[PDB]
Structures are given as structure tokens and as C-alpha cells.
Amino acid sequence: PFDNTTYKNLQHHDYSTYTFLDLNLDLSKFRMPQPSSGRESPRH
Amino acid sequence: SNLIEVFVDGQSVMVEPGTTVLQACEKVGMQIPRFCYHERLSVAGNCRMCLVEIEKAPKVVAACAMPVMKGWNILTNSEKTKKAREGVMEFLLANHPLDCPICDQGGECDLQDQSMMFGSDRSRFLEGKRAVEDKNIGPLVKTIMTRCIQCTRCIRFASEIAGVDDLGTTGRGNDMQVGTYIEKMFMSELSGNIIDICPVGALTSKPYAFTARPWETRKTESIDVMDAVGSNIVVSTRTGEVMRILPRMHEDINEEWISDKTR
Amino acid sequence: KKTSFGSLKDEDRIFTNLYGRHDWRLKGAQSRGDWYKTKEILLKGPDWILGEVKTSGLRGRGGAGFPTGLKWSFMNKPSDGRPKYLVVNADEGEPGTCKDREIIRHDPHKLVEGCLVGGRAMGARAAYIYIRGEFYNEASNLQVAIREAYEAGLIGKNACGSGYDFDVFVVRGAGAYICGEETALIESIEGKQGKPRLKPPFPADVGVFGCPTTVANVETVAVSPTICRRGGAWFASFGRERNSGTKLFNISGHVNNPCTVEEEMSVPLKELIEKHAGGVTGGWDNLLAVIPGGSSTPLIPKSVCETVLMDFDALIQAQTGLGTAAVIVMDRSTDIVKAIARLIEFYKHESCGQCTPCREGVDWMNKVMARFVRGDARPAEIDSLWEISKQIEGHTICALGDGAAWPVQGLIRHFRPELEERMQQFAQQH
Amino acid sequence: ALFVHRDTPENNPETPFDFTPENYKRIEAIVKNYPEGHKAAAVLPVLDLAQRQNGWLPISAMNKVAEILQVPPMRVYEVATFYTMYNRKPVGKYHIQVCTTTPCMLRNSDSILEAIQKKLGIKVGETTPDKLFTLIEVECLGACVNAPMVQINDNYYEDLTPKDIEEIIDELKAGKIPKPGPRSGRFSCEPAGGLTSLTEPPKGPGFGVQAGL
Numbered sequence: 001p002f003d004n005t006t007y008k009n010l011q012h013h014d015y016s017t018y019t020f021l022d023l024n025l026d027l028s029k030f031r032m033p034q035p036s037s038g039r040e041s042p043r044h
Numbered sequence: 045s046n047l048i049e050v051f052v053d054g055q056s057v058m059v060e061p062g063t064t065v066l067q068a069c070e071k072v073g074m075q076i077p078r079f080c081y082h083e084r085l086s087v088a089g090n091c092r093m094c095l096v097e098i099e100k101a102p103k104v105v106a107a108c109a110m111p112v113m114k115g116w117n118i119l120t121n122s123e124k125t126k127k128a129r130e131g132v133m134e135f136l137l138a139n140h141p142l143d144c145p146i147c148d149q150g151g152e153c154d155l156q157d158q159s160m161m162f163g164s165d166r167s168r169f170l171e172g173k174r175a176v177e178d179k180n181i182g183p184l185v186k187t188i189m190t191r192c193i194q195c196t197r198c199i200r201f202a203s204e205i206a207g208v209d210d211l212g213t214t215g216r217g218n219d220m221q222v223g224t225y226i227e228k229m230f231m232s233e234l235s236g237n238i239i240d241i242c243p244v245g246a247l248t249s250k251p252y253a254f255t256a257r258p259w260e261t262r263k264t265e266s267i268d269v270m271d272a273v274g275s276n277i278v279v280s281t282r283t284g285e286v287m288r289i290l291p292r293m294h295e296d297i298n299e300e301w302i303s304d305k306t307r
Numbered sequence: 308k309k310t311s312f313g314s315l316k317d318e319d320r321i322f323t324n325l326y327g328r329h330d331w332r333l334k335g336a337q338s339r340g341d342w343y344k345t346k347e348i349l350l351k352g353p354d355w356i357l358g359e360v361k362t363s364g365l366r367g368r369g370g371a372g373f374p375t376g377l378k379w380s381f382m383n384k385p386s387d388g389r390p391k392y393l394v395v396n397a398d399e400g401e402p403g404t405c406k407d408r409e410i411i412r413h414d415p416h417k418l419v420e421g422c423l424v425g426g427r428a429m430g431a432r433a434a435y436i437y438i439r440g441e442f443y444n445e446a447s448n449l450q451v452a453i454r455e456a457y458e459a460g461l462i463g464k465n466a467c468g469s470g471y472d473f474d475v476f477v478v479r480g481a482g483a484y485i486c487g488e489e490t491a492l493i494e495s496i497e498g499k500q501g502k503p504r505l506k507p508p509f510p511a512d513v514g515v516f517g518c519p520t521t522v523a524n525v526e527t528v529a530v531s532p533t534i535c536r537r538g539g540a541w542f543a544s545f546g547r548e549r550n551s552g553t554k555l556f557n558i559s560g561h562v563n564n565p566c567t568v569e570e571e572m573s574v575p576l577k578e579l580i581e582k583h584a585g586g587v588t589g590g591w592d593n594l595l596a597v598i599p600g601g602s603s604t605p606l607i608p609k610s611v612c613e614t615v616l617m618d619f620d621a622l623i624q625a626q627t628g629l630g631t632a633a634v635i636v637m638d639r640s641t642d643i644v645k646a647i648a649r650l651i652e653f654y655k656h657e658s659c660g661q662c663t664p665c666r667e668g669v670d671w672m673n674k675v676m677a678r679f680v681r682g683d684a685r686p687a688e689i690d691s692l693w694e695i696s697k698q699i700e701g702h703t704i705c706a707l708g709d710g711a712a713w714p715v716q717g718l719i720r721h722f723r724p725e726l727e728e729r730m731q732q733f734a735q736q737h
Numbered sequence: 738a739l740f741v742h743r744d745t746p747e748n749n750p751e752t753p754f755d756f757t758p759e760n761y762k763r764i765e766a767i768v769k770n771y772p773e774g775h776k777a778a779a780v781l782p783v784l785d786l787a788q789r790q791n792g793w794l795p796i797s798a799m800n801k802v803a804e805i806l807q808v809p810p811m812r813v814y815e816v817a818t819f820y821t822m823y824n825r826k827p828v829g830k831y832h833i834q835v836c837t838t839t840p841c842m843l844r845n846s847d848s849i850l851e852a853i854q855k856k857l858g859i860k861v862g863e864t865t866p867d868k869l870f871t872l873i874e875v876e877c878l879g880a881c882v883n884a885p886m887v888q889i890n891d892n893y894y895e896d897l898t899p900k901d902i903e904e905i906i907d908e909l910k911a912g913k914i915p916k917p918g919p920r921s922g923r924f925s926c927e928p929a930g931g932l933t934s935l936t937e938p939p940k941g942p943g944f945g946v947q948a949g950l
């Protein structure tokens with residue numbers, strides 16, 4: 001049924017210190033290879 | 045061929061594309077005021093002392109960083125330009141310490157001289173000034189950092205010329221501080237050159253401290269013999285005594301730098 | 308045409324989960340029409356997408372209000388070998404503004420789809436979403452949605468089956484209102500101090516990592532998918548001409564029910580406060596002044612607030628600006644000088660310090676304003692403060708300097724008698 | 738809030754610091770978000786990771802981030818001092834941050850600030866003797882319609898009253914984790930006392946879609 005009387009954004013009550021970086025680590029396998037500037041850094 | 049035409053106070057000048065508004069004014073012999081800009085350092089555009097009116101443009105541009113466009117007329121002396129220089133000079137002097145009598149820069153100071161030429165003649169700042177602690181960076185350069193105007197010339201020189209990434213800015217806002225954060229000496233063979241490029245008495249020579257004033261020295265243009273490069277120097281003397289060594293511009297040899305041994 | 312604006316319907320609202328009453332994850336977002344025919348939009352082409360945005364009349368929701376279609380089309384050019392990026396500005400720093408927070412945490416999949424549709428229009432290979440570090444939970448919600456989109460084929464390699472590769476990266480800030488400025492945001496992503504760059508070059512030529520870049524506000528990007536699905540003409544049927552569409556509004560301060568609400572552009576300011584926020588505390592006649600578009604906009608007194616409309620052109624005529632459309636309401640119990648002095652204290656704390664007029668000038672204005680709060684000054688200093696603010700405005704690298712001068716100018720323009728009266732009180736005690 | 742460093746027994750280049758083996762995996766994923774040749778882009782997130790592991794940033798931690806990313810240490814120092822979320826001195830286990838900018842000021846954030854000081858017995862900028870709480874004022878936290886609010890560690894507690902915050906502190910003293918969000922009637926940014934919009938069921942897929950897709 002249709003309910004407009006409850007808050008449905010309660011998952012973040014269980015988030016912790018490493019939630020964001022853990023999610024970032026999980027996303028790594030989906031990324032496309034990064035482009036390259038041709039050197040290790042501007043100092044190479 | 046690709047030269048584009050611009051105007052400085054209505055006078056036409058032909059410049060290569062990529063020339064800045066500041067460089068275009070040089071071609072007709074006009075030197076725009078500056079503090080952060082040095083022609084041998086990367087463009088910074090933070091002091092805002094080079095602001096100049098472009099005819100028909102509501103907003104003044106930073107002459108040191110803005111490339112010219114075809115047909116632009118640069119109003120180096122307009123009331124809009126003049127009122128911008130006074131405003132910036134007034135902000136530069138708000139927190140600046142009343143140090144000229146005890147400051148070694150006195151008499152050869154760009155802040156003094158451009159305040160005289162481009163700033164106002166009085167103050168309306170009715171508050172207390174900022175005070176900053178000093179920082180030891182070795183026995184060659186004395187730092188009186190309350191005089192620093194945050195132009196970042198020293199930072200850019202250390203990174204780009206000396207190849208040393210030890211100088212930087214910490215904090216932010218009015219409390220932004222130039223230094224090394226930690227205790228560290230800036231002992232590069234080219235370190236003494238930051239005395240020259242610092243526009244104020246924030247960085248001065250420890251050996252030279254308090255010994256002379258600029259107007260009283262005689263300048264002998266000479267050659268360095270500490271190495272085989274042959275750097276061009278100026279020997280500053282007074283009353284029969286050598287007081288200091290300064291660089292002398294030679295594009296094909298030392299540009300405008302000398303080594304610490306030379307200095 | 309339409310002469311009166313407001314009373315928007317729920318059928319024409321874009322952010323249908325503004326209050327998080329429905330599921331924010333992909334299952335809910337898909338049921339509400341997100342990610343629908345995204346393949347059709349992508350295969351229609353960048354020029355068609357830019358056409359729908361140009362025709363929609365959409366203007367930047369970040370605070371400057373540049374026409375989005377024209378701005379986004381600067382990237383519509385052949386690659387020269389560098390990658391091209393879309394940067395989504397989720398720094399939400401302007402005091403009074405919390406609209407972008409609700410999109411990130413309750414409608415994340417509109418943002419994610421906005422990145423793809425907007426990214427395609429510019430030919431970008433990825434979107435970086437810069438979200439202020441304080442929004443830790445909201446950024447974690449956004450990563451959950453991104454993972455759902457990646458796992459459903461909606462983004463990544465061959466996104467939505469379109470044959471287009473797109474990545475959505477989330478990067479968090481570390482505490483700095485200046486990092487919402489478009490070039491200061493770019494310098495922050497690159498790992499530097501959040502200090503703005505001079506222009507030129509423009510980000511569309513040299514941006515993040517030195518590559519062509521477009522910085523777009525969260526709200527600007529998030530509505531773009533719906534503008535393409537429902538058409539630019541439907542979006543342009545809202546608000547006065549050159550003020551099109553639906554806008555998110557934050558009403559805070561001295562109102563009975565502070566809230567975030569989506570309402571038509573050009574709605575009267577009075578109607579917005581009373582219809583949605585429950586009126587001014589103590590009744591409308593208790594109104595003293597309103598800051599309409601966040602702390603960067605000058606305040607307006609009650610007399611102007613009576614008839615003013617909420618759009619870019621209407622508020623410019625009232626000598627202010629729409630800004631982020633964050634309405635801070637101050638009733639007659641407010642110490643107006645103190646309230647504006649706390650805003651200058653904010654800019655003093657947020658100036659990056661790079662350039663002289665703001666580094667020294669804003670700190671100077673803060674010291675003067677603090678004295679004005681107590682009246683420990685002379686009336687002749689009011690014109691000095693006005694002149695000082697005019698030396699900051701239009702002489703700085705970035706618009707933070709302008710945003711600190713404007714609140715001061717607004718106070719002096721409309722509340723000079725209060726300033727002088729306070730000075731008279733102080734002198735008679737001394 | 739000094740923006741210079743002076744070596745101290747508990748904060749000097751030899752102070753022990755290093756990322757855990759697990760955090761090295763997180764660091765690796767961070768670095769892959771940026772183009773090759775621009776690893777310096779990872780400075781802000783890697784520095785913040787060191788603070789999450791350690792709780793604050795000793796100079797050794799900054800020197801470690803510089804070394805991992807092959808970045809000059811001064812450039813890490815610039816970032817650590819520019820951004821206010823980095824702690825260059827140890828803070829309490831619960832870092833209470835009260836917004837005092839004008840929109841929160843207008844809703845009586847001073848009473849919230851007063852209540853926390855009375856309950857903890859500290860002034861703004863101090864740490865309790867048990868090192869459980871550190872109290873500071875901050876600028877707008879982007880929750881203005883929900884003022885007055887505070888942020889404690891990663892959570893926003895909003896629509897506060899002096900009683901509400903005294904409760905949250907009591908919960909944190911006992912060790913319970915208090916739920917974030919408004920402490921008043923409402924759940925988020927809705928108008929109190931009833932929705933004035935979005936009361937209809939949301940439309941479904943394909944609603945109002947222009948012909949031609």
C-alpha cells in the first residue's frame with residue numbers, strides 16, 4: 001500500500017567510521033581504467 | 045604575422061597572442077604596479093595591485109595574469125584604475141607594522157615606493173593590527189614575518205627556481221602564514237635570492253642587518269669570481285667599505301640570481 | 308501567459324522524495340520514474356540533450372544563476388586528447404542553504420542519473436561529486452546508490468546499454484565553505500588548499516587535473532534527467548520568462564515551521580513564507596527583514612518583502628539576488644546589526660586568505676561591524692565601511708569577497724538609522 | 738589554534754604512526770579514483786583516513802601521508818592546516834560541534850551552547866578532564882531549517898532544546914549511541930505539524946514523458 005507517514009531513510013543510523021571508505025573499496029571493481037598524464041607526477 | 049593590435053591609453057601596440065595586459069603596457073614604457081608578479085616566477089595574481097581598467101569593461105582585470113584581446117584599450121591612468129590601486133594599497137597597509145625606521149628595507153622598499161606613487165597619503169584604519177611570530181630558516185635570511193604581505197614570491201621561487209618545496213602557507217584567511225610549519229632551515233645554494241625577491245622587509249640578510257641604508261651606498265658593477273660562471277654583481281660600498289653583494293641582471297649568464305657563496 | 312506563479316502541484320514537482328517518506332534506494336527511485344528511458348536519452352545525442360536544457364531555460368542553482376544550457380555547451384567540442392570531466396558541486400556551504408542535502412540523501416538516484424545525462428551532454432568520461440565532509444551520512448547514502456547503479460548496469464561500462472562509459476566518483480571535503488567556489492572546488496579535488504583560480508583559463512578549457520571540466524550544482528544536475536524526459540518546454544512553462552522552472556526553497560529563521568519545500572519560480576515571497584512555513588513568528592507584521600538567497604545576498608526590509616517575487620530578475624530589481632533561494636526570516640525581536648555582524652564573522656572565518664582585498668578587507672570589516680554592534684563608533688564610520696566594502700567588491704579573485712561586501716551594503720542601505728541610533732546610545736553612556 | 742608546529746614528546750616526527758594493513762587496502766582504492774600522474778589528489782581523503790584510524794593528526798601522520806603519495810611534506814602541512822575538520826591536537830572521544838551562524842543563532846543556539854557548558858563544566862574550546870568531550874563552535878553545517886543543531890563525530894542532532902542536548906550527553910556518557918536527526922516531532926526537513934506538499938502518491942515511470950522519448 002501507499003504510506004506517506006514514516007521515515008524511510010533509517011539505514012544511516014547503522015553507519016560507522018569506515019562505511020564510506022568501505023563502500024569506495026567495493027566500487028573499485030566496477031571502475032574503468034584511469035587515464036594517464038604520461039608520468040608518475042609533475043615532478044618526474 | 046599573428047601579432048594582434050591592442051591600445052594602451054589609446055596608443056596602438058602590436059603584441060603576440062598570449063601577451064598579458066601587464067606585458068602590453070611594458071611595450072609602450074608603462075610599468076604597471078605589482079607585488080606578487082615576478083617575470084621569472086609563475087603567475088600568481090593574488091596581490092591585486094596590478095588591477096587596471098579595460099575601456100568599456102565594467103570590471104577591472106588583473107593585468108599580470110589577463111591575456112590581451114584584440115582591440116582592447118588599457119586605461120593605465122583612469123580614475124577607475126587609480127581608485128583600485130588606492131584600495132589595494134590601503135588593504136596592504138592595514139595590518140602592516142610601523143617598522144620603517146627599524147626595517148632594513150627602508151629606502152629600497154616597493155611597498156614604501158608604490159604607496160608614495162599609487163596609494164593614498166593617510167590612513168583610516170582605526171583597529172589593532174595583526175602580529176605574527178618569526179621563524180628561523182637558517183643563518184642567512186632573517187624573517188620578520190609581521191612585515192610579510194603574503195605575496196608568495198618566496199614560495200614560488202623556492203619551488204620553481206631552487207627546486208625546494210619547503211616553503212608554503214599555513215592557516216587561512218587573515219591568519220594565513222608563510223613559513224615551513226615545522227622548524228626547518230632553508231639552506232639551498234640559491235637561498236639568498238629570496239631576500240631580493242621579497243618586496244618587503246619580511247626577508248632580509250642577516251649579515252647585512254642594520255649596517256647601511258640604500259641611498260648612501262655606491263654601486264660598483266662587477267663580476268663574481270667565486271666560481272667560473274661569471275655572475276654579474278653589484279658591489280655596494282659606503283665610505284670606503286664593502287657593505288653587500290647584489291645580483292646584476294645578465295640574461296645569458298645568471299639572469300638576476302647569484303649563489304649564496306657569491307652573495 | 309501566466310501572470311501569477313506558485314501553487315505548484317505534486318504532479319509537476321521534480322524531487323518527489325524531498326522528505327524521505329518513500330524509499331531512497333534504487334527500488335523506490337525506479338518506481339518514481341528515475342532511470343526510465345535513460346538509454347533513449349543517451350542515444351539521442353549530446354546536442355539534443357543540450358537543446359532540451361537550453362529550451363528549458365534552466366539557470367544555475369548554485370548561486371550565480373548562469374543559463375545552464377549555454378554553460379554546458381562549452382564542453383560540446385572535439386576532444387584534443389585529454390579526458391573530460393563533470394564535477395558536481397555538493398559542498399552546500401552557504402548559510403541558510405540545506406536544499407542540496409535533501410537531494411543527496413533522499414533522492415540520490417536523480418543525482419546519479421543527472422551525472423550520466425549531464426555527463427553525456429558534455430562528452431565526459433566521469434563525474435566527481437564533491438560533497439562537504441560534514442555530510443558524512445549523506446555521502447554514505449550516495450555511495451550506496453552509486454553501487455546500486457553500478458550493479459544494475461546503469462553506470463560504468465556500457466551504461467544503461469548505451470555503449471557509453473561513465474564513472475561516478477564521490478570525494479569528500481574537509482571543512483571549508485570556500486571549496487564550494489567552482490575553481491576552489493577543483494583545486495581541492497587535486498589535493499591542494501581550497502584556493503580559487505583566476506580566470507581565464509576557464510574550467511571548460513583547463514579544469515580538474517588540467518582537463519576540460521564543467522562544475523554544476525547538485526540541483527542543476529539532478530533536475531536535468533527529468534527535463535529531458537518531460538521536455539524543456541514543460542519546464543519552461545513555470546516561472547516568469549528567463550526565470551523558468553521549479554526551485555527548492557529553504558525557509559529558516561523566525562518562521563513558525565522552518566522547512567524545505569519545492570515551489571514554482573517567481574512565487575511571491577510573502578506567499579512562500581505563509582503557505583509553506585506557517586507565517587512569520589508573531590504574525591506577518593512582526594517581520595523585520597529577510598535574506599532571500601543565503602547569506603551572500605543583501606537583506607530587504609518588510610516593505611520590499613510585501614510584494615517581491617522569488618526569481619533572479621525580480622530580486623535583482625529589489626537590490627539583492629535569488630542566490631541559493633534560502634530565505635532567512637528575521638522578526639522585529641532580532642538585533643539586526645548583530646545578525647549581520649555574525650555573517651561577516653562567518654566570511655572572516657571562511658576567507659581563503661589568498662588575495663588582498665578579502666584577506667585584509669573582510670577581517671577589517673569584521674572588526675568595524677563588531678564595534679557597530681555595541682555602537683562604539685562614530686556615524687562618519689558608516690560611510691567609511693560602505694567605501695571599504697566597495698574596495699573589496701569586484702577586486703578579489705573569487706566571489707566570496709563580493710558575498711561579504713553585499714550583506715554589509717544591504718544593512719547600511721536599509722538600516723542606517725539603527726546604526727546611528729545605536730552609536731548615540733553608546734556615546735551617552737560615555 | 739596555532740598554525741606552526743613545535744616538536745613535543747607526544748607530537749614529534751618520531752611519534753609512532755602507521756596505517757593498518759586494512760587501511761592500506763582502503764588507501765589503494767582511494768588512489769585509483771584519480772588519473773595516473775595525479776596521486777596528489779588523494780591527499781585530502783588519505784589524510785582524513787589517518788585521522789579516522791588515529792583520532793587526530795600528529796606530525797608523523799602528516800609525514801606518513803606525504804611519503805605514501807610521494808608528495809612534499811609541506812604540501813601535506815598546507816592541507817592539514819587549511820581545512821578545519823583535521824585535528825592537529827588530540828580531541829575528546831566525542832567532538833561536539835555547535836553551529837552558531839546566524840540562522841542557528843536566530844533559533845537560540847546560544848541556549849544549546851549554554852546547556853552543554855553547564856552539563857560538562859567546560860568552556861568552548863576545551864576538553865573534559867576525562868577526555869570524553871571536546872566542545873567548539875562551528876559555521877553553518879547545512880542543516881539550517883533544522884536549527885538549532887549540533888554535530889557529534891559523524892552525526893547531526895537537530896531541532897534541539899536545552900533538555901534534548903543534556904539527554905544526548907547523558908546517553909553518550911553511559912555509552913549508548915543516540916539516534917541522529919531531529920529531536921522534535923518531525924523526521925527531517927518537513928514542515929512541522931503537517932506536510933504542505935508531496936501529499937499525493939508519487940507518479941510512476943513514464944509519467945508526462947514527451948513524445949519521442
Ligand SMILES: Cc1cc2nc3c(=O)[nH]c(=O)nc-3n(C[C@H](O)[C@H](O)[C@H](O)COP(=O)(O)O)c2cc1C
Nearest residue numbers: 367368369396398399400487488489524527706707
Ligand atoms: C564562496 C562561494 C561558495 C560557493 N558555494 C557553492 C556551493 O556550496 N554549491 C554550489 O553549487 N555553488 C557554490 N558556489 C557557486 C559556484 O562557484 C558555481 O557558481 C556553481 O557551482 C556553478 O553551478 P551552477 O551552474 O549549477 O550554478 C559558491 C561560490 C562562492 C563564491
Ligand code: SF4
Nearest residue numbers: 144147150153244245
Ligand atoms: S617593508 Fe617597507 S613599508 Fe614595511 S616597514 Fe619595511 S620599509 Fe616600511
Ligand code: SF4
Nearest residue numbers: 192193195196198242
Ligand atoms: S615573505 Fe616576502 S616574498 Fe614571501 S610571501 Fe611574504 S612578502 Fe612575499
Ligand code: SF4
Nearest residue numbers: 659661662665703705
Ligand atoms: S576573495 Fe577571499 S576567498 Fe576568494 S580568493 Fe580572495 S581571499 Fe580567497
Ligand code: FES
Nearest residue numbers: 080091092094108
Ligand atoms: S601583480 Fe597582479 S595580482 Fe599581484
Ligand code: FES
Nearest residue numbers: 836841877878880
Ligand atoms: S546556520 Fe546552523 S546549520 Fe546553517
Ligand SMILES: [K+]
Nearest residue numbers: 239242244247
Ligand atoms: K626584501
